[PDB]
Amino acid sequence: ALPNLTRDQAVERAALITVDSYQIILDVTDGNGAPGERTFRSTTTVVFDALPGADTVIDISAHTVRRASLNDQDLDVSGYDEAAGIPLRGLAQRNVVVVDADCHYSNTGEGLHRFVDPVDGETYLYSQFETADAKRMFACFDQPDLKATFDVRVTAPAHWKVISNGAPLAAANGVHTFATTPRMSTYLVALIAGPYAAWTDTYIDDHGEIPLGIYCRASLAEYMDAERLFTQTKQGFGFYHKHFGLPYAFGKYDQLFVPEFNAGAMENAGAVTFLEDYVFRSKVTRASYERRAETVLHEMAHMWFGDLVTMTWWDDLWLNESFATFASVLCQSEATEFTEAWTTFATVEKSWAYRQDQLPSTHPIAADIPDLAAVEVNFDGITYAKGASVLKQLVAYVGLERFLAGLRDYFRTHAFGNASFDDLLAALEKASGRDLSNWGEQWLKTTGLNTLRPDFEVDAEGRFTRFAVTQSGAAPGAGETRVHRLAVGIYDDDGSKSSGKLVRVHREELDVSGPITNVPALVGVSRGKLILVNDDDLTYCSLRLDERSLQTALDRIADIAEPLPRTLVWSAAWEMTREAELRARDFVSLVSGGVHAETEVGVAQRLLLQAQTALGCYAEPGWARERGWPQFADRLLELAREAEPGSDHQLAYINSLCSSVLSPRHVQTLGALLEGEPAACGLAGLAVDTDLRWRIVTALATAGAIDADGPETPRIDAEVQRDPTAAGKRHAAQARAARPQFVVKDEAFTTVVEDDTLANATGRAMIAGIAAPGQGELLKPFARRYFQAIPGVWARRSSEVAQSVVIGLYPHWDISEQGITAAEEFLSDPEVPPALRRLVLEGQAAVQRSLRARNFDAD
Ligand SMILES: [Mg+2]
Ligand SMILES: [Mg+2]
Ligand SMILES: [Zn+2]
């Protein structure tokens, strides 16, 4: 097991050593010019200064350590254990350590991952090291405040491309060398190698030229849209260079779509890796292009927030992720075609922030992270989305100019170095010309949400006689009220002699503080028909509406002209549903009747997923099975049939039908789309392409309509013959596990929780099939099996890989007091490690929320 580095251990090591350079020499061949299969050779030379006479440890996870030396004295490696690294005893002032090892390839997305493409037999490698998996590829002091230069050399099969952080030098006789990097952290070192297809372009401005590359597997090249990605890339560099002062510091900029990736992307300096789902093989909506552009711009923002300046320790991961999230959405809004990015943020990412902040594991943005175990579960909706939301509010509070000026100072001060909370706040304080210590304490060091509401009286002509914004204390948390810069918007009719649309007819900006903030400027103003006290989504809060405004919202959501205020209403309704203030069936009604007016297909997609959570988790289950699901499925098919042919909305409604709980009529309709012209089904212009076929096959498998005679799967196997790709095989694995047969669920469950050799990406696909909609009664036995299995999975697999089972197989379907008690009994053992307890507490809290919602929906 790799070492669980503690905050205290990291501080202790950084007080003793300062690293200059690494030289990393890799051989990823089999020693005969072909790709290696199990291990690769890694020979690392590190130069570092030390307090003379101290001891340290160099980290390394290897199959074999062949030799290790300190200042050319050979070390005894006969007792080598990856948990202990290699001890370095009696350090000199100036040191050279060499470690020559055979390291293991990964098939679980941590370390140097190896994949074989079934289409062409080609091998592809990529690295992934955040947080502390660099030690699986090279010996190092694996912590982010021990920066160093990197000089990488790789021996590879002759036909391969080889990409690292640095620009390539000409390769010779299998050997690829790279330009030495600037000083950076070990978790950012990259290796991507194999017969990847390439595209090239260049970004040019007054600062100079950045060579751009895009890479993907050869078998996916026909699907690449490199011009669109290069356009977005260049828009990003133009925006960041306009605002951040220091230009991009890491040379060239390669973007590599890699197989079996665990996350969405990773900001390795000069060598950003991506989930290869972003190479679209089939038709996707604008939602997918917009999310991919956000990801491109997020990784690029990290070239400043994480790569140029890095947090000292993982408690300040928000310095990377809150800022990268905020900056990427700002850049998307202002520099790209995705001009509604703040609308998408308010519906998609803020909903994630609220869910995370309300769990019993809620933690401040500036977190307390005692060890690696704690950070490996902290890449979450607070570190990302709440932090970005709170930074958006800081920009409202001090203004964008002072905010950006403070960041430009921060970058210049800490360039190629490390920063903590106190360093960031010092820079923003200097630039803002005011004390932000109280602001930081109440916003960055707290948990929870403040509820914001209008409180007013009106005269007989509907004009305010008094208006305030009321603010609840933070919950869950320490109950404080905060300072907010926010806007009050009043919405009313735009029509000539007509209702027409609800448009903004009055706006007031104000400084809100404490429980009640009077708004004198609204005395004598018409109350209109809908009041929003977080207009333009400037602050992080729980928004609620006065009675009349809420009735207007529930009746006229489709009349709100502008996407952002319409999203503020969708979000308030969804949050009221989560909070047992709006019945599940009323939220489903609202979406079913209003989504035709939601022009932003990304927002519409999220509303349909919410409606599906409402039906599957929040609604009285008898009503959901007998009425709610079949009505929602019928509405999706009506919506699809009324949509424009070939449109994004047409596809979204059919995608949602494929993930719903189906009646026999819906099963017939979807099966007909596999065999026939879609026009015959009233769906002219719908492309029943490779991935929509798989979504339909998975729906038919889930419904018991195909391969229902026994565990054999001739129909799904025929679909793999049609699409015999790594993607088709993972979709097939999902579809086979989705079938409502106990023996199929049991075989899949046992495979994924037992077989440590199974690729994590395949496991995940099987888990998505196990936990299929509508199957909660069938899956009840797997609740106890889950609680009995997860300690072993957590002990055998890394946190990130174990999470596939711990998060993905939590029994969210067992919505009962017995299900709550099952988690309580697991949690009653005080020796369960804190990160595993956290994930079970979160699962238990989601089921508790579902029970409270079902009681509200029934009554
Ligand atoms: Mg071939
Ligand atoms: Mg990781
Ligand atoms: Zn990030």
Automatic annotation (TrEMBL):
InterPro entries: Aminopeptidase_N-like_N, Aminopeptidase_N-like_N_sf, ERAP1-like_C_dom, Pept_M1_aminopeptidase, Peptidase_M1, Peptidase_M1_aminopeptidases, Peptidase_M1_dom, Peptidase_M4/M1_CTD_sf. Residues 110-188 form the Aminopeptidase N-like N-terminal domain. Coiled coil: none annotated. GO terms for biological process: peptide catabolic process; proteolysis. GO terms for cellular component: cytoplasm; extracellular space; plasma membrane. Residues 530-849 form the ERAP1-like C-terminal domain. Residues 232-443 form the Peptidase M1 membrane alanine aminopeptidase domain. Its EC number is 3.4.11.2. Keywords: Aminopeptidase, Hydrolase, Metal-binding, Metalloprotease, Protease, Zinc. GO terms for molecular function: alanyl aminopeptidase activity; metalloaminopeptidase activity; peptide binding; zinc ion binding. It is an enzyme of class 3 (hydrolase). Belongs to the peptidase M1 family. This is Aminopeptidase N. It comes from Mycobacterium tuberculosis (strain CDC 1551 / Oshkosh).
